[PDB]
Scaffold this active site. Structure first.
Site, PDB file in Angstrom:
ATOM      1  N   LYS B 163      77.340 -47.681 -38.023  1.00  0.00           N
ATOM      2  CA  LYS B 163      78.067 -46.521 -37.354  1.00  0.00           C
ATOM      3  C   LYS B 163      79.075 -47.095 -37.277  1.00  0.00           C
ATOM      4  CE  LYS B 163      78.221 -44.974 -33.439  1.00  0.00           C
ATOM      5  NZ  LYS B 163      77.847 -44.493 -32.101  1.00  0.00           N
ATOM      6  N   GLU B 189      82.322 -45.545 -22.557  1.00  0.00           N
ATOM      7  CA  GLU B 189      82.360 -47.474 -23.347  1.00  0.00           C
ATOM      8  C   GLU B 189      81.482 -48.095 -22.695  1.00  0.00           C
ATOM      9  OE1 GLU B 189      81.449 -47.535 -26.475  1.00  0.00           O
ATOM     10  OE2 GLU B 189      82.414 -48.553 -27.717  1.00  0.00           O
ATOM     11  N   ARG B 190      80.104 -48.025 -23.170  1.00  0.00           N
ATOM     12  CA  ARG B 190      79.623 -49.863 -22.652  1.00  0.00           C
ATOM     13  C   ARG B 190      80.442 -50.909 -23.140  1.00  0.00           C
ATOM     14  NH1 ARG B 190      73.307 -49.444 -24.583  1.00  0.00           N
ATOM     15  NH2 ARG B 190      73.841 -47.200 -24.236  1.00  0.00           N
TER      16      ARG B 190
END
Ligand SMILES: Nc1ncnc2c1ncn2[C@@H]1O[C@H](COP(=O)(O)OP(=O)(O)O)[C@@H](O)[C@H]1O
Lengths: 477, 469, 56, 423, 464
Positions: B163, B189-190
């Site tokens: 992705k 966002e991690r």
């Protein structure tokens, strides 16, 4: 002076709303005239909600409340190693005080985006099931979720016990856990000698919620020390499900508007801002690491429960421990199906990287297949072959307790069955095979497993291929 | 124009102001303080006006941590909702919800223009009229799931399906053939992820052309809820100022809505279906409508929709879907076979696929190429039954043609050149229509499978037939 | 017989697919009614927990 | 006195002191120029529902009366224009010079002010004008999942309003502004603005607007209805109204009922549709929209609006499968005598029921629903339509006039029908 | 009074010692200027808020009101014109003629719409079954004279039409005093019904009371009391009465609309904490006594097809006979869509309906249930693995579940079929033969939408 202290209006349920303290910082330690500590959370116009950390009975109205001017910090140092202390750092193991020079604040910001380096350096769990299928590198975060009495603790323990030769300074945070267990556990560490690298932070189920709440962060703090030095830490938060709950209580008491499932709106922020504090520091920072092992206790195994879901999405993957597997006598109770490690594979070493690739396959099909045996009375196709080593791998994935396995002689057994050097042996004899195939190596392949160490590779393939026969060709049946 | 801190409830802070002047709702409040004594700790924090409680008191939601506040601190009013840098300054840069660069490349000069993140959607007369398709130069996309210029595409999935690359490639193909910039907004966002992402775009070099925003998870519900707006704003610039077609990526737009209900609680909102902020539709409607093609520019958004527990009725996604003009469904299957992009040819849909829009030519072939797939897909059962022999020749032709087709949906990604070496492809819809129509005429049935697997224009498949010697 | 049986197993091989396939659809029809009842439930629980707080 | 002072500002909800003379339901005005309604009237304050941006409202801003209870600009000047629920033009065509105004909340024609329906409203969409008729002054609920053609239906129905005398009002609630546009020029191409009003409430817009939008439309409509003229109104998603109102309603902290929707969530839709209906000039049809998640008719809101309307169902699969319109003949139904006498009186019927979007008359219509077809294979069937249509517009151009003028078909065409076939 | 707080339909009128509960306040005001609008409104005292204040519930739009206006206490609850003048007229919630024919005499008796329910001495016991001509009902769930009938059904299930068919099948031929109050129901119905009343020839003997979907909550709140007081007249002042209440749900529904604004603690689902009692005080009133008899049939809407919803749920314990309508059966094409295993009646006794009618009654239900259980298998394995005995039960059951369909005269204009009233002896018999297997040869479709069993044989041959 006149402002910097306050007087208790209301007392009960570990909470104290005091007057005065017009200068308390949100998150400042506040001491009560009775010596018992606390913390300011709600700074309102007319009062301040405090969460009493310790016995709240020795507190009545009118008691004085005097500030500290410190934000909830905690002892940190090379002397805690081997000591059992509460979230305050107060030794409870009953051997002397903890003599440490330095200190660090519980609440701390996490290493910045730039500050970190993609995890490559592994964490050897010593558990075939884990460091083959669901691999964990230093600086990672692997949530081990499961229903009570699945072994969640056991794992963490044997993991720690597997940290002696590795360079890992371990920290076991017990939240909500029975002080009973935490003791019998801190001991079985005593015996295996985990205390030489292992810190224990406990808040049992008898201790007040605010301590439970503080225990996890109080844990990472002590870890963070060795991390920002360049050393490697492994923090096991045992049961965030309870800590997260303890916060709900405390927060509900301060009559904070409750959210879905009663949990406060920041319940997610709670864990998020916690777990992130574990990572791999960029070489620019001494390349340290703090690896975190969050537990989530599940009811009925509902993965769809609110808290268990949050943490699932927070961590880098998880390890889901089946409730039934555990009883059927399959230890560890891992569910290879749902269990996944996202950072995976950069964590594994080449010598595993290869013999692990196929491991998922054989086990995959077997999971989608062996729903059928009793109807397989007609056992058909080659679908019998997939099962073949399949039911055998399971045997190899079954491990003892309190008995870690070094990668060296691990990759070999995860090799054997995956090459067929196991297949000629019935499941009855698979477990009690790998048992002496180790010794057979510790004497006669002690040279072979070496190449496995010093190179973390097996380009090996040829020698072992024949060298494996050296064993089956002497084994019993 | 100053005010003072009354109450600090976690992520919720009250300010407050002394008569007269009250900061407007959504105005950025700065609290800068720092350590006067050793009993305090330096404060840099910002707040956003939410509710005017009254008695000259506002309720603000902190975009950062409130540890260290004390009642009485002076809260400066910026006189404007959260402005953030916009321009050639943003490109190759990484920011936070505030617009403060979180990278190591130095900070933004007080010169640079700053725009407020909150702002109404373009006027009914501004945004365009004709529905025009934005060319991705990616086969599977442009054909089976066309992108509408200035629209929203659901990006589903994302474990090892590449992705990232598909995004990376997209930023690339736009900035080249369409000459337009990308702005990625990692919402919640991690950080491990946010780090890789950035690095990956440093090696791929797609960064030179994009603005990076990180609303990371460990951020407070306020921060996470407004990150999307920051990225969006930076994007709108290039739409209206430079009249471009810019890409706006939002990785997991659910984090946004989730932050939405998450904040809603704190402000004491009575929950709605499934504990969702009652103001959900509204909060989503305002995020999307600001994404479109103006008479001048356009903004195409690719939002990774990670649906809630596999339930497509959940108000969270269900809301989102109403704002969707397209879907790119990534599946690990097609990846395992060696088809990248991993875009599922029968699942990934689009609104642009219609005669009214793409004419019969496109719609015909395209609707056909799907049919020949849903044929080869169902015969999977009968093939394990009657085998590849005499399974009905009107079918074996399908099975043959279909294989090459699902193979010719895989393309050369420029971004991929890093580790592959094949420079990569850009095929117009025109080209992609022919290559398929021809294959659907069977004009290629005499060529090996491993021909159409990872290439450009149909002509490349053909040259891939020289096995030399 | 051989051709009879050949049919039998076959006819059964299939009738045991029709059931499987159909049963699989019974999931969809239920998955849907489960989600819906998953929703109304989590909505009622919450509404209950707040409405019991505003009462204080 | 009139002028009040803002006390509390937030979420489209503002309350203020003073305004001692304000009437309940009086559209007040704030200083920043934003309009608002007075919903709640307390002893020490005034509940006011901001209709528009609330950012520009702070504590202390001035709020003045109007003395007009919740109205909106009415007149001819609206036709072909795109305005918000406040009538105020958004299509940037310049202001609307109107004369007369009509109040938003109006009582619907009494039992005695009503007559049973006779005059048909021809949608031109075969499947509908045959299987589920809609008579002028009826309410036919068009219900279906996301992306089933609901939008198109209402639109093909509008172009088809050029012949009869019908003023269409398309009220887009909670719809994408972008959708609204592309929808509004298709009306331009086909020249529907000449007879139609378009009121847009975008999803970017605040709740209160969407809540009002469906009413501002009927108001504008009743004008022509109350005048003897015939009107047609489109709500696209009463769902985001029930929802929008639900939002506002919960922001007000009004205790929530089932599915979070206020107890009055029924009244909301009932008192709206129960509005549309010769001692009065014999004057409005309502085509409500409801979006269902996974074809669940058993839903709260959906069942509600059913217990009101006099409905059509668009299958989810039968579109993507290739049926446009996607009508579900079984679950669809029409209560109200509408048909033409020409309409009143299997695999090939489907191909016929299939109609091309954006291409709408009953005349050559009742014929194709007659034919004389079964001998021709499916594919060329629908194909057949186009031809056999042309041929009739030339040869049977005299055979049509019998259908139209008499709306009845009491042998000839029976032969034719062997005029275009045998050829 | 002086109104100092206006909340939607709930108005707070302030009053020393004046303190008017259940009384009607009229606000009679005239526009003093051009910034005002003429107000004619009637508030019903609800509760005493203290400090000499009262919270009231409007009977119409409260728009235009202002703080400080003047409220007059009529010194009595909502009084409605009652008497032999009410016949062939249409009243309001207040008892105002909306039929545009004159008004009501000042001499006319005006009763209050709030009365206490008849005591234990009053209400009757006696049992008498009542024929409706509906095969389902008469057989599985028979109605009772002077007894209470509920009609439970969700949206678009056929409640309305079923009522129409009842008034058609019964009201016309009874000889009784009819009282029809549409509560919260449709506006079209009112005109459909009012102008068919004239056709038929009863708009003499029927009392018309309306309020529909366009009226505020307060309205629907009492339209069920107003109409009840009407029938209560002919019962306690003179004969038997047929009380047709259309959607008693709208009463409770409107209830919740006000319950919030009253400042009440919401109950389950957000319904009024008084929902139960509020219905108890309006039901028992609809009852037959030793003075006069009241046979009432009430339409009960089912919100979201949930019979567990407090409104219809709580309603169940109020009826002597029920007819529960199912959407499933409706889409099957089975009309009326009436649950053959849910609908009940206290009449089903051998000690009431006779043995012959009883045993068939259960016999049908028995075989319908036995088919119900089988359905999961059929839905999974088809009928192939069912026994040669269970299959038979599948045929009978179906054909019995189809014969339970009926032609309602108030249908025809749509479908085009004329209609039928099936005598009770003929329903009882018809099913007998079917259970007894004289018809096991005839195809299902033959039994669909018919009257007397003979017709099935007729429509049978017509098939071929
Ligand atoms: N007995 C019947 N025969 C044929 N059609 C019916 C019958 N009962 C109901 N219907 C159809 O079902 C629909 C529902 O009618 P209605 O009685 O208004 O439902 P409800 O009053 O419960 O909302 C009508 O459109 C009608 O066409």
């Amino acid at each position: 002076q006149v402002s910097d202290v306050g007087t208790v209006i209301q007392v009960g349920d570990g909470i104290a709303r005091a007057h005065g303290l017009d200068n308390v910082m949100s998150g400042e330690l506040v001491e009560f005239a009775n010596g018992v500590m606390g913390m300011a959370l709600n700074l309102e116009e007319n009062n301040v909600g405090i969460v009493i950390l310790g016995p709240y009975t020795g507190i009545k109205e009118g008691d004085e409340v005097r500030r500290t001017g410190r934000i909830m910090e905690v002892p940190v140092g090379e002397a805690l190693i081997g000591r059992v202390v509460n979230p305050l750092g107060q030794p409870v193991d009953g051997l002397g005080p903890v003599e440490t020079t330095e200190t660090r604040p519980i609440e701390s910001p996490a290493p910045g985006v730039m500050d970190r380096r993609s995890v490559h350096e592994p964490l050897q769990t010593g558990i075939k099931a884990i460091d083959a299928l669901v691999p964990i590198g230093r600086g990672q975060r692997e949530l081990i979720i499961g229903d009570r009495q699945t072994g969640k603790t056991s794992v963490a323990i044997d993991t720690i016990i597997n940290q002696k030769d590795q360079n890992m300074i371990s920290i076991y945070v017990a939240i909500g856990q029975k002080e009973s267990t935490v003791r019998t556990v801190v001991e079985t560490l005593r015996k295996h000698g985990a205390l030489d690298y292992t810190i224990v932070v406990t808040a049992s189920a008898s201790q007040p919620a605010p301590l439970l709440f503080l225990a996890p962060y109080a844990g990472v703090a002590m870890g963070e020390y060795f991390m920002y030095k360049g050393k490697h830490v492994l923090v096991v938060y045992d049961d965030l499900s309870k800590q997260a709950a303890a916060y709900r209580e405390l927060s509900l008491l301060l009559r904070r508007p409750p959210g879905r499932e009663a949990y406060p709106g920041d319940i997610f922020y709670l864990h998020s801002r916690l777990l992130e504090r574990a990572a791999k520091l960029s070489d620019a920072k001494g390349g340290g690491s703090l690896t975190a092992l969050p537990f989530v206790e599940t009811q009925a195994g509902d993965i769809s429960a609110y808290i268990p879901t949050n943490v699932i999405s927070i961590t880098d993957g998880q390890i889901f421990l089946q409730s039934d597997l555990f009883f059927s006598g399959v230890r560890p109770a891992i569910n290879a199906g749902l269990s996944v490690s996202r950072v995976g594979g950069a964590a594994q070493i080449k010598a595993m990287k290869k013999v692990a690739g196929t491991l998922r396959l054989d086990l995959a099909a077997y999971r989608e297949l062996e729903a059928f045996a009793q109807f397989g009375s007609d056992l058909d196709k080659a679908t019998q072959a997939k099962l073949a080593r399949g039911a055998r791998t399971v045997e190899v994935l079954k491990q003892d307790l309190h008995q870690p396995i070094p990668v060296e002689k691990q990759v070999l057994i995860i090799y054997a069955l995956t090459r067929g050097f196991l297949d000629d042996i019935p499941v009855e004899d698979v477990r009690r095979f790998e048992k002496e195939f180790y010794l057979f190596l510790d004497q006669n392949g002690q040279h072979l497993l070496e190449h496995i160490r010093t190179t973390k590779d097996l380009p090996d393939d040829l020698n072992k291929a024949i060298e494996a026969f050296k064993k089956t060709f002497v084994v019993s049946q | 124009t100053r005010g003072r801190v009354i109450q600090v409830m976690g992520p919720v802070v009250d300010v407050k102001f002394e008569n007269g002047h009250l900061p407007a709702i959504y105005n950025a409040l700065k609290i800068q303080h720092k350590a006067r004594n050793e009993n305090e700790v330096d404060i840099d924090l910002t707040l956003e006006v939410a509710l005017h409680l009254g008695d000259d008191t506002v309720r603000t939601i902190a975009m950062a941590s409130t540890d260290g506040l004390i009642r009485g601190m002076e809260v400066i009013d910026t006189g404007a909702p959260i402005s953030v840098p916009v321009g050639e300054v943003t490109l190759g840069r990484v920011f936070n919800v505030l617009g403060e660069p979180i990278d190591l490349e130095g900070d933004i000069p007080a010169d640079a223009r700053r725009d407020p993140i909150h702002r109404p959607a373009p006027k009914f007369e501004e945004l365009a009229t004709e529905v025009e398709i934005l060319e991705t130069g990616i086969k599977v996309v442009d054909l089976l799931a066309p992108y509408i210029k200035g629209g929203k595409i659901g990006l589903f999935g994302g474990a090892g399906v590449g992705k990232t690359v598909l995004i990376q490639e997209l930023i690339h193909n736009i900035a080249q053939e369409h000459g337009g910039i990308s702005v990625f907004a990692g919402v919640g966002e991690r950080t491990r992820e946010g780090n890789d992402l950035y690095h990956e775009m440093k090696d791929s070099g797609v960064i030179s052309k994009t603005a990076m925003v990180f609303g990371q998870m460990n951020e407070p519900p306020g921060a996470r809820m407004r990150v999307a707006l920051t990225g969006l704003t930076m994007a709108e610039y290039f739409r209206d100022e430079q009249g471009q077609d810019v890409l706006l990526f939002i990785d997991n737009i659910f984090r946004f809505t989730q932050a939405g209900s998450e904040v809603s609680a704190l402000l004491g909102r009575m929950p709605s279906a499934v504990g969702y902020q009652p103001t959900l539709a509204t909060e989503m409607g305002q995020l999307q409508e600001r994404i479109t093609s103006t008479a001048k520019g356009s903004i195409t958004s690719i939002q990774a929709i990670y649906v809630p527990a596999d339930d497509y009725t959940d108000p969270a996604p269900a809301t989102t879907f109403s704002h969707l003009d397209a879907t790119t469904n990534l599946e690990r299957k097609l990846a395992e076979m060696g088809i990248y992009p991993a875009v599922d040819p029968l699942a990934s849909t689009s609104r642009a696929l219609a005669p009214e829009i793409v004419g019969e030519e496109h719609y015909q072939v395209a609707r056909k190429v799907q049919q020949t797939l849903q044929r080869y897909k169902e015969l999977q059962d009968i093939i394990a039954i009657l085998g590849m022999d005499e399974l009905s020749d009107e079918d074996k032709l399908v099975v043959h043609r279909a294989r090459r087709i699902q193979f010719f949906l895989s393309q050369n990604f420029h971004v991929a050149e890093q580790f592959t070496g094949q420079p990569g492809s850009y095929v117009p819809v025109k080209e992609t229509v022919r290559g398929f129509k021809e294959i659907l005429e069977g004009k290629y049935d005499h060529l090996p499978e491993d021909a159409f697997r990872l290439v450009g224009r149909i002509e490349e498949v053909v040259e891939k037939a020289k096995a030399m010697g | 017989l051989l051709d009879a049986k050949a049919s039998e197993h076959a006819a059964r091989m299939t009738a045991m697919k029709n059931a499987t396939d159909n049963a699989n659809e019974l999931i969809r029809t239920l998955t849907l009614s489960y989600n819906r009842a998953r929703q109304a439930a989590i909505t009622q629980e919450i509404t209950e927990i707040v409405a019991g707080a505003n009462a204080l």
